[PDB]
Design a binder for this molecule. Structure first.
Ligand SMILES: [Cl-]
Ligand SMILES: [Co+2]
Length: 88
């Protein structure tokens, strides 16, 4: 298994507040140097669709790190970041 946080609450809050969701990932080498690799920008606004997408993603990145990102669409700056999965 992997170490995860209870990220559904943040997904829901980001969607409800109108922030754009994206993610990024890193293996141990890239985590050690903060060189995250780009993941998807999730266009759905349906909480169930976003959560299903993130679950597939976390399964693909088992053994790696994954960071959930919220962005202000207007300012294009990050309003939220959390490492939602780490190696277990
Ligand atoms: Cl989605
Ligand atoms: Co949290």
């Amino acid at each position: 298994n992997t170490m995860t946080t209870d990220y559904g609450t943040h997904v829901r809050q980001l969607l409800q507040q109108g922030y754009q969701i994206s993610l990024e990932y890193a293996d141990a080498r890239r985590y050690r140097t903060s060189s995250w690799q780009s993941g998807p920008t999730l266009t759905g606004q349906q909480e169930s669709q976003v959560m299903a997408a993130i679950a597939q993603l976390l399964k693909e990145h088992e053994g790696e790190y994954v960071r959930l990102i919220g962005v202000d669409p207007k300012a294009k700056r990050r309003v939220f970041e959390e490492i939602i999965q780490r190696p277990g």
